[PDB]
Amino acid sequence: TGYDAVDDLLHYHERGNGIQINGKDSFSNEQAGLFITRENQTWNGYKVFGQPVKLTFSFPDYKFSSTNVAGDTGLSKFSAEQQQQAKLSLQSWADVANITFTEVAAGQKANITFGNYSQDRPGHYDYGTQAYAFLPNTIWQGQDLGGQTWYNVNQSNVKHPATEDYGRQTFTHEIGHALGLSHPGDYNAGEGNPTYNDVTYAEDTRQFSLMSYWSETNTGGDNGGHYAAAPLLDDIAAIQHLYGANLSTRTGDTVYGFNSNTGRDFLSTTSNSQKVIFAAWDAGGNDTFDFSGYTANQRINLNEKSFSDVGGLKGNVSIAAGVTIENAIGGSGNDVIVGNAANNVLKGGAGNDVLFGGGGADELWGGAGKDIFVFSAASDSAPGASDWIRDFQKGIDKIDLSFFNKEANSSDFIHFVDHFSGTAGEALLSYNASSNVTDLSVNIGGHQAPDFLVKIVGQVDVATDFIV
Amino acid sequence: SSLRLPSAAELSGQWVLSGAEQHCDIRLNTDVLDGTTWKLAGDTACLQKLLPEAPVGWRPTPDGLTLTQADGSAVAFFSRNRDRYEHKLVDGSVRTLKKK
Ligand SMILES: [Ca+2]
Ligand SMILES: [Ca+2]
Ligand SMILES: [Ca+2]
Ligand SMILES: [Ca+2]
Ligand SMILES: [Ca+2]
Ligand SMILES: [Ca+2]
Ligand SMILES: [Ca+2]
Ligand SMILES: [Zn+2]
User: Fold this and answer.
1) How much distance in Å is there from the Cα of A341 to the middle of ligand 7?
2) How many CB pairs under 8 A join A and B?
3) Closest-CA distance of chain B to residue A96, Å
4) Which listed residue (A30, A174, A191, A203) is catalytic?
5) Which of A127, A235, A379, B77 could form a disulfide with A231 if both were Cys (CB 3.0 to 4.6 A apart)?
6) Shortest CB distance from B4 goes to which of A130, A174, A214?
7) Residue A384 CB: number of other CB atoms within 10 A?
8) In the beta sheet, which residues pair with residue A266?
9) d(C-alpha A68, C-alpha A44), whole Å
10) Other Cβ atoms within 10 Å of A22 Cβ, number
């Protein structure tokens, strides 16, 4: 049934609550956020949480023969490309939390700094490490090391972050540390043989946080060989805990994916081949997840803290806690689109989609193909504030009422009558030729008046257009 | 602190996928499948026996190795455990990938 599809998607990646995954405890979005910040070190002081902060950053002119505190040499200033990408990563952190970054000239004292290194000791090239950084307030041998980030420029992705997403992710990750974040588990590159087995909680993968070292596939995600460029779901929780949630971000009507008006490279795509991977942070307005240009079958869930399978990837798109996205547009593949308690506009596009508006007054469009419109609660669409199916195709599309039957523990519960008696499960279909609207009334709770109403633009054949 | 991402080049070569006593010889090539994936050569028959599907591509990751379908979607990811890469099936069966 169309309902089963919806049900699967609503129970995709459940977490916390004593769940055990991969032999590890499952942490919730909130627990994971606090754990990633276990060091309690912030730019506002030890254990000073939730205050905004304004930091400076620079790209110092390191001389090749110098040696940094870590004993690395063969240094250099960030190239133009590296500086460009580093500024994009900085911004993505500023988008989610109350952090204000301002660049100071190379030579001015800055909180966060970037530099390349290429040798572990004079004349010896280091082709093994990737990068490292020091958390704020890191006192070592009488001096503060906090905010320094170092990258091994011998690695092509570090040298070319703009064309190699792993390099871009490395910048965001190291900046996470410089801001106060730790790996979600106690492991460190090169320190022995750390593996996913050393994690504290199951959600310690790249699917949930870019501070993690482990493949998103460990929890079932699949990013097709790409790496998120901006803070993921658990990252957002961690950083918002430290410096507060940025309630000024994208407070207008924002579109993510295709036809985006975000002005963020990671929240936008212009082709089916450009896949997106992001965790949405939006502070207001009427927003839309536009995934129309993708030809793959997609699953879009508009509930906060949930995962969607977008553009052919798995668990690549999510919505941060406290965020309300209102509309979603599927692509040409067969999609499953689930709304939330807000009034949503869901469009399936081509292909055979399943649409579920949930609560509130939704407007649904199946588009081309044989689509299914799913209902599971009378209050989903109550008379006087009903859902609207804007393009029903008689004999092609279907209305799924099966849930009410399963819930009533009887298949013959829902039954079409020509006149209401006040009996429960009575369904009544009437057509308005003046407006070309079919009105579907159902009396779920056996009331004097029906408690469920769906207004459908078009005609419905009761003999073929229903799933019960 | 981050892990480095190996190159297709350094991981390419002759590998053996060891399953329920079976062994498939596969060649992880540097031929390009797509933007983030390279080509893999091997006996599909053999591969079907040890994996949920015969993969056609692969790619290194900082923590392991991913065997993919023609469109790049993951068939099986093998984590690096010291000297070998291992993957567990839905039923918990282990599959090992070791460079010959
Ligand atoms: Ca907005
Ligand atoms: Ca909104
Ligand atoms: Ca569709
Ligand atoms: Ca809704
Ligand atoms: Ca459709
Ligand atoms: Ca249709
Ligand atoms: Ca509704
Ligand atoms: Zn790190």
Assistant:
1) 8
2) 72
3) 22
4) A174
5) A235
6) A130
7) 7
8) none
9) 25
10) 17
Q: Which two tokens stand for residue A436?
A: 């070309």
3-class SS of residue A88: helix
Experimental approach: X-ray
Please give the structure tokens belonging to residue A373. Answer: 């419109």
> A15-246 maps to which CATH number?
3.40.390.10
Q: Which tokens in the block code for residue A227?
A: 């790496």
Q: How far apart are CA A339 and CA B18, in angstroms?
A: 45
Contact A57, A97 (CB under 8 A): no
Indicate which of A134, A149, A214 best probes the interface with B, i.e. most B CBs within 10 Å of its own CB: A214
Q: What is the CATH number of the domain that holds B56?
A: 2.40.128.10
Residue with tokens 């700094």: A113
Centroid of ligand 4 to alpha carbon of A409 (angstroms): 26
The reply to whether residue A218 touches residue B77, judged by beta carbons under 8 angstroms, is yes
Residues of B in contact with A190 (CB under 8 A): 1
- Cβ-defined contact of A183 to B63 (cutoff 8 Å): no
Number of structural domains chain B divides into? 1
Ligand 5 centroid–CA A261 distance in Å is: 25
**What domain range is B21 assigned to?**
1-100
Q: Determine contact, residues A354/A297, Cβ cutoff 8 Å.
A: no
